[PDB]
Structure formats: C-alpha cells, structure tokens
Amino acid sequence: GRFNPFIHQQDVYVQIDRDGRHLSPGGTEYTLDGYNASGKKEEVTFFAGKELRKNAYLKVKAKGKYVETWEEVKFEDMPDSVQSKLK
Amino acid sequence: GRFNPFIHQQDVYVQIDRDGRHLSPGGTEYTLDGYNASGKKEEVTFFAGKELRKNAYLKVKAKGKYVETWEEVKFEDMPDSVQSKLK
C-alpha cells in the first residue's frame, strides 16, 4: 500500500430526517444523504452516543473518507448552497 | 461520495535508510519503503521539521491512505516479521 500526508478535511451537513438504528452498547447509527461545504452530494454513516432529535441539523467532520465527529448546527449557519439543498 | 467511521488503521514500520529531500522552510520529505506487523510491503510519505537520524526505526500510524503520526522505536520493540525484513 501507499500512504501520504496530504490530509483533506470535509464537513458533511445533514438533517436527521430518517430513523436511526441502535448499536449496543449505547450507540445510535444514522446513514443520511448530505452535502459537503462546497455543496457536493454525499452519503454519511456516523454514530452518536444518544438518539438525536428528529429534524435537527448536523455537521459531520471527516478526514479523507473517515468520519471523526458530529456537531449539531442551526440551518441559518450552514453553507448557503447547503441551505438551498436541505431546505 | 461515501463517508463512514470504519477506517483501516495499521502500524507501518520503516528505517531511515534513504536521505530526505529538503523542502523550504526547515522541512524534509521522506518517502520510505516499510512493512506492517504481518510483513506486507508499504510506502510511506511524510514531512519532518528536522532531518531524522540515519538508520533510526519509525513506527508510523497509518489511517486509510493517510500517515497520521509517527514515533521512533527500538529494533527490539518491532514485531518479529518486521525485524526479519528490516535487519
């Protein structure tokens, strides 16, 4: 294999518009369609340590294709083209 | 594209057996041919801020296609298969 140090961050914006699925112990999985910071369509699978509120907006931060973190955001603070696609 | 939290993490072992290429300011590019714990061939590219000592051994943590971090290790702390290929 070949490994490089050229780290590409992406942030995928989603709405919690599908049911989660429990993952024992204490996890909730979501697989949702979303948009990155440049408005490109993405699919993201991520886990939270609690069940998230229906219709909340989330930012999921990734390095390469690997998801690292989730964070709740408000609609009005998401990227403009993401707001247009997720409204 | 598709994102998930299921990234292949592995330790890749290298020896500083090529000199680096100086990148200004104060940088060095190393592209070294190493081995994972089960002896499969790997190529790692990373940047340093000081030239590393010749014939030192590094354990590099690889996460997907990315070099995440590295540290110097003693020959004796490497797995038997790595000691075999890098002696």
From Swiss-Prot, chains A, B:
Keywords: Signal. Disulfide bonds: none annotated. It comes from the Bacteria. Transmembrane segments: none annotated. Induction: Transcriptionally regulated by YxdJ. Induced by the antibacterial protein LL-37, probably via YxdJ. This is Uncharacterized protein YxeA. It comes from Bacillus subtilis (strain 168).
